[PDB]
Design an enzyme around this catalytic site. Structure first.
Site, PDB file in Angstrom:
ATOM      1  N   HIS A  83      38.323 -77.336 -12.089  1.00  0.00           N
ATOM      2  CA  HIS A  83      37.967 -78.285 -13.149  1.00  0.00           C
ATOM      3  C   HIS A  83      36.447 -78.407 -13.191  1.00  0.00           C
ATOM      4  CE1 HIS A  83      38.251 -81.249  -9.761  1.00  0.00           C
ATOM      5  NE2 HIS A  83      37.502 -82.055 -10.496  1.00  0.00           N
ATOM      6  N   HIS A  85      34.096 -80.662 -12.551  1.00  0.00           N
ATOM      7  CA  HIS A  85      33.247 -81.498 -11.707  1.00  0.00           C
ATOM      8  C   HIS A  85      32.409 -80.657 -10.733  1.00  0.00           C
ATOM      9  CE1 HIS A  85      35.922 -85.344 -12.283  1.00  0.00           C
ATOM     10  NE2 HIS A  85      35.061 -85.165 -13.268  1.00  0.00           N
ATOM     11  N   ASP A  87      32.047 -80.594  -7.558  1.00  0.00           N
ATOM     12  CA  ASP A  87      32.640 -79.996  -6.366  1.00  0.00           C
ATOM     13  C   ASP A  87      33.479 -78.766  -6.667  1.00  0.00           C
ATOM     14  OD1 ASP A  87      34.659 -81.482  -7.616  1.00  0.00           O
ATOM     15  OD2 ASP A  87      35.529 -82.238  -5.779  1.00  0.00           O
ATOM     16  N   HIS A 148      43.929 -85.621 -12.815  1.00  0.00           N
ATOM     17  CA  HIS A 148      42.606 -86.016 -12.316  1.00  0.00           C
ATOM     18  C   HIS A 148      41.541 -85.782 -13.385  1.00  0.00           C
ATOM     19  CE1 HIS A 148      39.053 -86.079  -9.645  1.00  0.00           C
ATOM     20  NE2 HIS A 148      38.728 -84.942 -10.230  1.00  0.00           N
ATOM     21  N   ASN A 179      37.908 -90.815  -7.460  1.00  0.00           N
ATOM     22  CA  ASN A 179      37.132 -90.679  -8.689  1.00  0.00           C
ATOM     23  C   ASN A 179      38.085 -90.457  -9.849  1.00  0.00           C
ATOM     24  OD1 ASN A 179      35.567 -89.819 -10.825  1.00  0.00           O
ATOM     25  ND2 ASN A 179      34.973 -87.886  -9.857  1.00  0.00           N
TER      26      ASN A 179
HETATM   27  S1  LIG Z   1      36.402 -84.889  -7.824  1.00  0.00           S
HETATM   28  C1  LIG Z   1      34.588 -84.470  -8.072  1.00  0.00           C
HETATM   29  C2  LIG Z   1      33.623 -85.019  -6.956  1.00  0.00           C
HETATM   30  S2  LIG Z   1      31.964 -84.375  -7.298  1.00  0.00           S
HETATM   31  C3  LIG Z   1      31.175 -85.968  -7.415  1.00  0.00           C
HETATM   32  C4  LIG Z   1      32.246 -87.091  -7.401  1.00  0.00           C
HETATM   33  N1  LIG Z   1      32.024 -88.277  -6.574  1.00  0.00           N
HETATM   34  C5  LIG Z   1      32.808 -88.289  -5.424  1.00  0.00           C
HETATM   35  C6  LIG Z   1      32.841 -89.053  -4.247  1.00  0.00           C
HETATM   36  C7  LIG Z   1      33.787 -88.784  -3.251  1.00  0.00           C
HETATM   37  C8  LIG Z   1      34.696 -87.762  -3.408  1.00  0.00           C
HETATM   38  C9  LIG Z   1      34.687 -86.982  -4.572  1.00  0.00           C
HETATM   39  C10 LIG Z   1      33.759 -87.223  -5.590  1.00  0.00           C
HETATM   40  N2  LIG Z   1      33.573 -86.528  -6.879  1.00  0.00           N
HETATM   41 ZN   LIG Z   2      36.970 -83.990  -9.921  1.00  0.00          ZN
HETATM   42 ZN   LIG Z   3      37.128 -83.483  -6.231  1.00  0.00          ZN
END
Ligand SMILES: SC[C@H]1SC[C@@H]2Nc3ccccc3N21
Ligand SMILES: [Zn+2]
Ligand SMILES: [Zn+2]
Ligand SMILES: [Zn+2]
Length: 231
Positions: A83, A85, A87, A148, A179
Site C-alpha cells: 500500500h 504508506h 513503511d 487499513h 494508524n
Molecule cells: S501503516 C504506515 C506506517 S508509516 C508511518 C505511520 N505511523 C506509524 C506509527 C506506528 C506504526 C505504524 C505507523 N505508520
Molecule cells: Zn499503512
Molecule cells: Zn504499516
C-alpha cells in the site's frame, strides 16, 4: 525466535527464514518517541528474489539490500509495495537505483503521489475490484477490498502456505487500533472475510507489524477494528 522490536536497532534489518525460499524482513523505526517494528517478505523466484515492501525508509532499505546480499546472495529483481504508506514505499528510490523493478497497483501509485511519497515505477494490472487475484512470479497478489487503506494488497506464497497480510492484519499483541487515518473501518471486516475465504489453508500469517501467527490473526483484527468502530 521471531525477532522482536526490542532486538533490532533502528537502521538495522533482520531476516527470518519461514520456509524453503521464503523469508520475512524485519526493521524498526522511531515514531513520536516510541519504536515500532515493521515486516516485509522475500520470496525466491528461481535464481532471483521477489521483495514484498521496503524496510520503512531509505536507510533501512539500503541495509535490507545489504543483508540480503550477505545472507542470501541472490539478486532482488522485482519488488511489490502493498500500500502507499512510507513503511511500504519508503525506500523505493533506493531499490530503483539498485536496478530493482518496483511495482504497485495504480491505486497505490496514485495515493503515494498525492501523499508526496515515493512512487513504484510499474503498475500492477488486474487488482482493481475486491476479490481480484493475480499471479506475480512465485506469489499470488490479492486485493481483498478496502481495509487499513483503500489500496491494500495481501500476498500468498502457495509453495509454503504463507499469507502476508501487510497492515490490513494486526498482530495478536495489538489490542487497540493503529494508524487508521486512511482506513475504511466499515469495509475492513468484510475485506478480512474475503482473505479468509480465499486462503483458508494458510499456515503462517504475517502482519504488517509484529509477530506472525496463524489464521486467528484475521478474526483478531476484525475484533480490534470493530471495537475501535464502537469507540
Ligand atoms: S501503516 C504506515 C506506517 S508509516 C508511518 C505511520 N505511523 C506509524 C506509527 C506506528 C506504526 C505504524 C505507523 N505508520
Ligand atoms: Zn499503512
Ligand atoms: Zn504499516
Ligand atoms: Zn522497469
Amino acid at each position: 525466535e521471531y525477532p522482536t522490536v526490542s532486538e533490532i536497532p533502528v537502521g538495522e534489518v533482520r531476516l527470518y527464514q519461514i520456509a524453503d525460499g521464503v523469508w520475512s524482513h524485519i526493521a524498526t523505526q522511531s515514531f513520536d518517541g516510541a519504536v515500532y517494528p515493521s515486516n516485509g517478505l522475500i520470496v525466491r523466484d528461481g535464481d532471483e528474489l521477489l521483495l514484498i515492501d521496503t524496510a520503512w525508509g531509505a536507510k533501512n532499505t539500503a541495509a535490507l539490500l545489504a543483508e540480503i546480499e550477505k545472507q542470501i546472495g541472490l539478486p532482488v529483481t522485482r519488488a511489490v509495495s502493498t500500500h502507499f504508506h512510507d513503511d511500504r514505499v519508503g525506500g523505493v528510490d533506493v531499490l530503483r537505483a539498485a536496478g530493482v523493478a518496483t511495482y504497485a497497483s495504480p491505486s497505490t501509485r496514485r495515493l503515494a503521489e498525492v501523499e508526496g511519497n515515493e512512487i513504484p515505477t510499474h503498475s500492477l494490472e488486474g487488482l482493481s475490484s475486491s476479490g481480484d487475484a493475480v499471479r506475480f512470479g512465485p506469489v499470488e497478489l490479492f486485493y481483498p477490498g478496502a481495509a487499513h487503506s483503500t489500496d491494500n494488497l495481501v500476498v500468498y506464497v502457495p509453495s509454503a502456505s504463507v499469507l502476508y497480510g501487510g497492515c490490513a492484519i494486526y498482530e495478536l499483541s495489538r489490542t487497540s487500533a493503529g494508524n487508521v487515518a486512511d482506513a475504511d473501518l466499515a469495509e475492513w471486516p468484510t475485506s478480512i472475510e474475503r482473505i479468509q475465504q480465499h486462503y483458508p489453508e494458510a499456515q503462517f500469517v504475517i502482519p504488517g507489524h509484529g509477530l506472525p501467527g496463524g489464521l486467528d490473526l484475521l478474526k483478531h483484527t476484525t475484533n480490534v477494528v470493530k471495537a475501535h468502530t464502537n469507540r
